[PDB]
Amino acid sequence: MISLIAALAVDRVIGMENAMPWNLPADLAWFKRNTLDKPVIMGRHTWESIGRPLPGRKNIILSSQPGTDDRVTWVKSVDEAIAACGDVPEIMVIGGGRVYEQFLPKAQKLYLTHIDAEVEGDTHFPDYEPDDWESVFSEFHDADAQNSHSYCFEILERR
Amino acid sequence: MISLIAALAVDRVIGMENAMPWNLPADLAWFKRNTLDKPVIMGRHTWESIGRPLPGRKNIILSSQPGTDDRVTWVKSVDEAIAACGDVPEIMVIGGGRVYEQFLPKAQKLYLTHIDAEVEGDTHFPDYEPDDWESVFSEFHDADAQNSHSYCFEILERR
Ligand SMILES: CN(Cc1cnc2nc(N)nc(N)c2n1)c1ccc(C(=O)N[C@@H](CCC(=O)O)C(=O)O)cc1
Ligand SMILES: CN(Cc1cnc2nc(N)nc(N)c2n1)c1ccc(C(=O)N[C@@H](CCC(=O)O)C(=O)O)cc1
Ligand SMILES: [Ca+2]
Ligand SMILES: [Cl-]
Ligand SMILES: [Cl-]
């Protein structure tokens, strides 16, 4: 099954021209917890943003352009990306916008981090129909000594 | 010689308790480069936001409350903090507000990171009459894939 994992600010903003203006180690911990030991599929821009391969995961980069790093797997189609995953119970799609749009239709679950941040965004998470998804987990947290904004973790399963 | 190092948003607003709404790894690198191998003095809120002893530095916490942890030095007054430092060429004071207020009068150098972020806050870096201080170094940087905002490093010497 395919799952999408994303951090969304108000109005579904997922990316800006520069790094997102928040400091949320709790979100990174949640992301690591939910992606460890699974293949992760990402676009080139996300890859460049991370800076290195994510440890303990099979890193798959979906891009039309050619591969710049030998430590990860470079693919050119959604179909090739899927095949590269092998026989695994769950494949995680980590962004960005375009990638999420291409995988949404095939996704059965969403792991979402809603962040109370108002920002002008460049890219947005695709519009989902809340009537088509069932929230099976939610947990709210306020900003604290280490997290700059309040956020809420949510997991949704396709109805 | 006592130095204060701080990251300031517009209007000199500084953190109080919750993490600041920005992501500036360049500023943390700057921070590390200027404090490594030196004693650092911080208040209780700063300590909680860091979450662990800064490696390669002598960690001194100035607070009225008590020493939770044994890996760091707990002091109750300015004088005691100074003394805990021993005889070193430079003592770094890393915040927060009250701590900066207490040491400014005794400070000979300021390492400041001016960030182009408008943050609502109660706390401000103490007022310094820049004509009692000589700006010795200033280097601007634009925001990028890794740094959420534009920032400018500045070093000032007490004239
Ligand atoms: C820019 N970026 C993309 C990113 C960031 N936050 C997200 N948060 C959520 N919920 N979902 C995403 N898809 C997401 N993607 C990043 C950047 C760094 C790391 C990262 O360092 N992760 C470490 C965990 C944190 C650490 O070790 O500092 C890991 O092992 O996953 C992950 C994603
Ligand atoms: C909350 N906090 C206080 C903090 C943050 N930025 C500042 N920035 C400046 N310029 N000045 C300060 N006094 C300052 N203080 C922190 C939090 C984490 C780290 C930190 O992790 N530092 C690592 C470097 C980054 C890393 O290893 O992730 C180090 O070795 O100094 C430092 C300060
Ligand atoms: Ca439910
Ligand atoms: Cl991308
Ligand atoms: Cl403090």
Where are the domains positioned within chain B? 1-159
Query: Parallel, antiparallel, or unpaired for β B151-158 and B133-141?
Result: antiparallel
Long-range contacts of B134-142, Cβ-Cβ distance < 8 Å, separation of 24 or more? B134/B159, B141/B26
Nearest to B149 by CA among B121, B109, B99, B113: B113
B7-46 residues touching A, CB cutoff 8 A: 17-23, 45
A95 lines ligand 1 (CB under 6 A): yes
**Resolution of the coordinates, Å:** 1.9
Nearest to A108 by CA among A156, A60, A152, A39: A156
Residues 6 or more apart whose CB falls under 8 angstroms from that of B106 comprise B2
Alpha helices in B69-155 (DSSP H): 78-85, 97-103
CA distance B155 to B159: 13
Verify cis geometry, omega within 30 degrees of 0, for the bond prior to A121.
no
Best residue among A28, A30, A61 to mutate for probing ligand 1, ranked by most atoms within 8 Å of CB: A28
CA distances for B43 relative to A108, A150, B1, B50, B134, angstroms: 48, 24, 19, 11, 27
Sign of CA dihedral A15, A20, A23, A25: positive
Nearest to A125 by CA among A93, A91, A81: A93
Does the domain formed by A1-159 have CATH 3.40.430.10?
A: yes
